[PDB]
Design a protein around this ligand. Structure first.
Ligand SMILES: *[C@@H]1O[C@H](CO)[C@@H](O[C@@H]2O[C@H](CO)[C@@H](O)[C@H](O)[C@H]2NC(C)=O)[C@H](O)[C@H]1NC(C)=O
Ligand SMILES: *[C@@H]1O[C@H](CO)[C@@H](O[C@@H]2O[C@H](CO)[C@@H](O)[C@H](O)[C@H]2NC(C)=O)[C@H](O)[C@H]1NC(C)=O
Ligand SMILES: *[C@@H]1O[C@H](CO)[C@@H](O[C@@H]2O[C@H](CO)[C@@H](O)[C@H](O)[C@H]2NC(C)=O)[C@H](O)[C@H]1NC(C)=O
Ligand SMILES: *[C@@H]1O[C@H](CO)[C@@H](O)[C@H](O)[C@H]1NC(C)=O
Ligand SMILES: *[C@@H]1O[C@H](CO)[C@@H](O)[C@H](O)[C@H]1NC(C)=O
Ligand SMILES: *[C@@H]1O[C@H](CO)[C@@H](O)[C@H](O)[C@H]1NC(C)=O
Ligand SMILES: *[C@@H]1O[C@H](CO)[C@@H](O)[C@H](O)[C@H]1NC(C)=O
Ligand SMILES: *[C@@H]1O[C@H](CO)[C@@H](O)[C@H](O)[C@H]1NC(C)=O
Ligand SMILES: *[C@@H]1O[C@H](CO)[C@@H](O)[C@H](O)[C@H]1NC(C)=O
Ligand SMILES: *[C@@H]1O[C@H](CO)[C@@H](O)[C@H](O)[C@H]1NC(C)=O
Ligand SMILES: *[C@@H]1O[C@H](CO)[C@@H](O)[C@H](O)[C@H]1NC(C)=O
Ligand SMILES: *[C@@H]1O[C@H](CO)[C@@H](O)[C@H](O)[C@H]1NC(C)=O
Lengths: 322, 171, 11, 322, 171, 171, 322, 11, 11
């Protein structure tokens, strides 16, 4: 009569590494590293992302004509740019503190596009029909949907001074532009004053802009330049524009709402009818595992990114079916 | 292993023991068979469950983390942001891989120890009423029916009850 | 997590 | 006759966690995590902190009238601001590179407030009595203690040009201001020149300031603005001011000494007659433990901050009094 | 535990042994009592003292660290500074908690090993002049007075001196 | 140590065993001598080689890392860059020193375990044909020539072959 | 007859630390910490470094006369500055975005110094012989080798407008300067126009510079200032200079090639005929060890820097020859 | 630190 | 790395 003591064994082919030995076949084990995604852009906690289509942030914010127009009000969980964004700034020039603006938009969860300065109504004694071929649409020369190219009317550019009081109860993103002709002849033909200036003030913002005329290499067949500026007008505060030339005036502005967990990602994937808690530029992750090796860029509640190819924890025994 | 049982003086595992990690095999007149030890298996499961769960718990939820952009005159800040991201990534990859290796080693050792401890528990219960025939087995110096076997398995083996007969067979 | 490796375990 | 081998046991109820098991009662154990503070602001290695009272850094440096005046010379181990600092910049405008200035002050251990440009003596042919209601004191309209509002005298604002040579043997923080009237009428009534300018130079500093006139939303009942500037004048170097208007001149400046281990903290607690080696905004820590979960902001020699609620090391045995 | 002594074949601890971590209890004609083993207790104390002290030493003094401020047009730099502070904090919280857990496990194992080693040392000293009656106890096959007991405790037990009498009682 | 062999019941090492980590010494009529056990030495070497190599592998190549410069109006960014460099340095110094300490402890324990396991393997091979005379040595109850010794060393000891003679000498 | 089980021992005196015990003598062990360097500057993967001799980056790029002239084309693996660099900016003034420029140069692997605007040929009707004593060479007053001080000729400073088209197929670093006289008398004597201006444009760069006249403390016996500017002209793009005074024109520019693994280090050591895979400011490291405690600054493939004095791994046994 | 848990220890 | 501590090892 005999009794023996022994241990479990099974057919498993799971292998784990240890310090003293690599590649040990074990009976049981747990994988801690997520490596699978669904290859789709999804809703994040039930909220769809903001897709900019053919535009980047600049093209969308300035109102590039080539980009399909979005609904007046939007709410999102994250912003998606496409890698090949052909439509951005269409009239050559610098967009000041653009990166800072993107970083601001990274915590915005909603916008309302509203007419801050109505077209035919706000700039009397000035022309508002200025267009350009650098910003073409359907072949014809056009211009930014959110801005207005003010020029001389009937041989004169009278000093304008207009203002907006923010009664939206939220921050209002106001954008404008400053035009820089390549010569003084064009400066006179457009704004009738060689010593022009633009002034923009709020309670906490205070800037003055002066035309700087010089011949420049052609960009998008333009020797002139256009510098783009922006400011966030606090609730209740007032913004004042004052100019006698060169002002690319605001026409539409954005009432903004703040949120958490958002961000801007560059992605190729397509939006699908699906929901997730974790979104990467390559696809959505549905996992409760502590690590992932899919992508460093994550939106939502995601596992920690690591470079590892394998993170497998043994729980069972050294497997010896022999 | 560290305690010398698994892949040691007990060469291999039992595909035939399907209801636990550690267990017994017996052979007597009534027949033979496998029966796992639940007290030890359930202790090991509790332990390793708590180990896995802590490895998961120590890693917090990774909330939103996306890239930033910098203009052509902010190369230093761009490289510093990159330096930060790469540093943190190195450190976490290192930490994860190392923790998994260490804990794997300790887990195999833990199992080895459980098997050895079970063996020793049985040995100390049986004393000289049986002999160690190697490979983790005991040969009784007396008849051990199903009831006797079960008394051994649930830790209530009655040594004096079989001491005489065993002494006689051992001679 | 729960390790349901055997069917008589308690959790 | 018998002898037994055994181990210690005691009544202890200390519990520690392990990997395989949580909550194990042990005979002995060491706590590594400090969680206690005295709730007071203390001396740090025998040196009292700099308390700004009702002021923040800006209000103290500009010389806001509402803030009790400090002794001429001070030395400290750290700087304390109160959360509700009502008195800062009292006349609306931007304080340029303010954050950088705070960071400079973070390694300053002493100041001496001295008269760099004496009031009645340095700006002849100009008025020096300018005051405002935005900077009121005891009801009456007043002005910064460290600055001087130079205006026109007897219908004229002659070009001034004054200088200071630094013979303190230390860095000298010099502050000044540039005023921006809302209209040209006020510009003329104050400085008698519509094309005014201010110039400030040292061996390594070189800046020119131009008035920018425009109507602005009222801030503290002021449509005008005042921009504040600063520079650190190296030992032996000379600073030169030159202007024909809009200069808010320096009157008092600061001779500064550098030190180590200092910093600026926002705190509610009160100063007491006590000494410590480690100070947090919530209170002082007296411990030699390696960790603390009290506050991330520390001044001095402190334990490392962690989020942990518990860090207890076992030293004794598994306690089984049964 | 890993070595099977503490909470193992030696079920519980002794509230009555107040002068050490590991020790003895004896019973003879002259009476009974507890006496800790200092050689092993003092070795364990040295070890664990060095462990605690290294855990403290590896953490450097945290010198002054305060927040910075950024204007409304420096959001990126503010978020990068925050990212740095939060990253370092995560890593140190992780490191601290993990190190304490690991070392706690190893400390309990260390104690278990010390008790087992002491037991084995005694067993090998006594050989067949006594019998293992379980629970970490030995029953002598001979009279063992205070001097004999002490010879066992300080590792100088004279086996041949009692070999005959033991052989007779063991029969 | 943790398993009680090295610096334990086997007090010291052998300067005379020059061809391995663990081994034997024998004494019979034909003479005496040392001979290392290759199966265990080679297993230990494999293990520790893999340990060292992983400690090296887990540390990636440190590519170019140089300082940056900042003007007098960028003190915050300079201090943030410094904060980053010092933080990463603290963390890596900590990680390196701790990993080396932990692994050293485990390595000594590993050796201790190998020696104990070898001893137990021999003991279980010999059974009652020899007696444990302490210090890791066995005294045969029978004549054990070079061939017998080698059978013990390469794990093929024939217990029944010497059982009778041993029984007689043991009486 | 007897057989004993035992373990190795040897004469080794290697000591390692453990957690429970410090300073344990062992039979075998591996050192993981590299602490040795050869004290020399070496080639890095077969490519010699760029040594600036008496110059820093500024002095080399501007063309300080005191610094021996380098070959027209250079390629390197890293850049070395000496601690005591006496020759940098020789005419007092600010070098704008200098730090950013250094950071750009940190990934440059080659330059070609070529004449972008030939001296006698590009600025007709202007003098090009301007020199100064602040930039002296061999006793005589001189000037930057890469820049040209344009002044009035025959009592007149006609408006100049010159341009360069980049056909190098690489980025071209262009540097220039803007002079600021201490008084209007000198401004007139040099540039004959009190209302002078300088304009520099490319497809993506657009800046205008105005003289700012004021008396300043003497630096290198100069009360005037000279501000230095730079831009990277993309392949195919055109840069345009236009001015009627104060322009310190470009004469030589740099065609630049990008590379990886480079950097700028400050070192004392000397270049030797040797090669390495890892270079530090103190000397070169030849090791495959995972750590080093030699220096935090490394170029190439180097071990990770740690503060540790010792990192020794045991592999053998506790050594007990007793 | 010192672990004064018993009164005959050496430190 | 390779630990050539004895001369009959395999690596
Ligand atoms: C890791 O171990 C696995 C076994 O668990 C090895 O895979 C086996 O390799 C042998 C030899 O080629 C094959 O006959 C088996 O069919 C393999 N098993 C499986 C499940 O694939 C593997 O070679 C080892 N790898 C390393 C790198 O050591
Ligand atoms: C951790 O263990 C402690 C024991 O050390 C537990 O506290 C005991 O809980 C029982 C059950 O409620 C009480 O009867 C005792 O009075 C408690 N002791 C003390 C000192 O409070 C505790 O419940 C355990 N906690 C967890 C989360 O496991
Ligand atoms: C660390 O251990 C070494 C031994 O490996 C000690 O060095 C020995 O110290 C004794 C006492 O002074 C000398 O007689 C020996 O000659 C030393 N050996 C060598 C090789 O130098 C050393 O003292 C220990 N250090 C610490 C800090 O514990
Ligand atoms: C191993 O065998 C089990 C049955 O015992 C079977 O269910 C399973 O599919 C097999 N696994 C693999 C991976 O072959
Ligand atoms: C995630 O996957 C699990 C596994 O099937 C499933 O239970 C759950 O519904 C999934 N959730 C989402 C949001 O996809
Ligand atoms: C095992 O012991 C238990 C007592 O705890 C006893 O009741 C049981 O009957 C024994 N085994 C069996 C089922 O015979
Ligand atoms: C435990 O008992 C000791 C006496 O042995 C006594 O001094 C102590 O106060 C008790 N501790 C607690 C926490 O009850
Ligand atoms: C800190 O506390 C300890 C504990 O009582 C005391 O010895 C020491 O004097 C205290 N020091 C200070 C500065 O409070
Ligand atoms: C224990 O052994 C020591 C020798 O080391 C001996 O002197 C002592 O007397 C023994 N025990 C006692 C005190 O009887
Ligand atoms: C040891 O055993 C082997 C069989 O594996 C045998 O061939 C050999 O002869 C034995 N030892 C010697 C060399 O006598
Ligand atoms: C130790 O002895 C060996 C010979 O066994 C000799 O080669 C070596 O030089 C000695 N090592 C030292 C450090 O003394
Ligand atoms: C580095 O040192 C090793 C050790 O001698 C040598 O084999 C190798 O040639 C050296 N290489 C260089 C580039 O110095």
């Amino acid at each position: 009569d005999t009794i023996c003591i022994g241990y479990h064994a099974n057919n498993s082919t799971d292998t784990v590494d240890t310090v003293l030995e690599k590649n040990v076949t074990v009976t049981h084990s747990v994988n801690l590293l997520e490596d699978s995604h669904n290859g789709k852009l999804c809703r994040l906690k039930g909220i769809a992302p903001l897709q900019l289509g053919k535009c980047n942030i600049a093209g969308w914010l300035l109102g590039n004509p080539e980009c399909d127009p979005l609904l007046p009000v939007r709410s999102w969980s994250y912003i998606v740019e496409t890698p090949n964004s052909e439509n951005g700034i269409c009239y050559p020039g610098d967009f000041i503190d653009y990166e800072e603006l993107r970083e601001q938009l990274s915590s915005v969860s909603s916008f309302e596009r509203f007419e801050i300065f109505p077209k035919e109504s706000s700039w009397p004694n000035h022309n508002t029909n200025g267009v350009t071929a650098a910003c073409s649409h359907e072949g014809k020369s056009s211009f930014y949907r959110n801005l207005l190219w003010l020029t001389e009317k009937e041989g004169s550019y009278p000093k304008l001074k207009n203002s907006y009081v923010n009664k939206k109860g939220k921050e209002v993103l106001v954008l404008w532009g400053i035009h820089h002709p390549p010569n003084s002849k064009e400066q006179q033909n457009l704004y009738q004053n060689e010593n022009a200036y633009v002034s923009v003030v709020t309670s906490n913002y205070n800037r003055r802009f002066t035309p700087e005329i010089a011949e420049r290499p052609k960009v998008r067949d333009q020797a002139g330049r256009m510098n783009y500026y922006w400011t966030l007008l606090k609730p209740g505060d007032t913004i004042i524009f004052e100019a006698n030339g060169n002002l690319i005036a605001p026409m539409y502005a954005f009432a903004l709402s703040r949120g958490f967990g958002s961000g801007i990602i560059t992605s190729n994937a397509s939006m699908h009818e699906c929901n997730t808690k974790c979104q990467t530029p390559l696809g959505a992750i549905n996992s409760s595992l502590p690590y992932q090796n899919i992508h460093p860029v994550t939106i939502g509640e995601c596992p920690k990114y690591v470079r590892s190819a394998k993170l497998r924890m043994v729980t069972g025994l050294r497997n010896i079916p022999s | 292993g560290l305690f010398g049982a698994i892949a040691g003086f007990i060469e291999g595992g039992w595909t035939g023991m399907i209801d636990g990690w550690y267990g017994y095999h017996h052979q007597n007149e009534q027949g033979s068979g496998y029966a796992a030890d639940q007290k030890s298996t359930q202790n090991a499961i509790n332990g390793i469950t708590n180990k896995v769960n802590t490895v998961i718990e120590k890693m917090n939820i990774q909330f939103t983390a996306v890239g930033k952009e910098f203009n052509k005159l902010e190369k230093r800040m761009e490289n510093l942001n990159k330096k930060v991201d790469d540093g943190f990534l190195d450190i976490w990859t290192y930490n994860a891989e190392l923790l998994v290796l260490l804990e794997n080693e300790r887990t195999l050792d833990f199992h080895d120890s459980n098997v050895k401890n079970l063996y020793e528990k049985v040995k100390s219960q049986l004393k000289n009423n049986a002999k160690e025939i190697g490979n983790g087995c005991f040969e009784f110096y007396h008849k051990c029916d199903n009831e006797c076997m079960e008394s051994v398995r649930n830790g209530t083996y009655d040594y004096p009850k079989y001491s005489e007969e065993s002494k006689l067979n051992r001679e | 997590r729960a390790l349901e490796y055997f069917e008589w375990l308690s959790x």
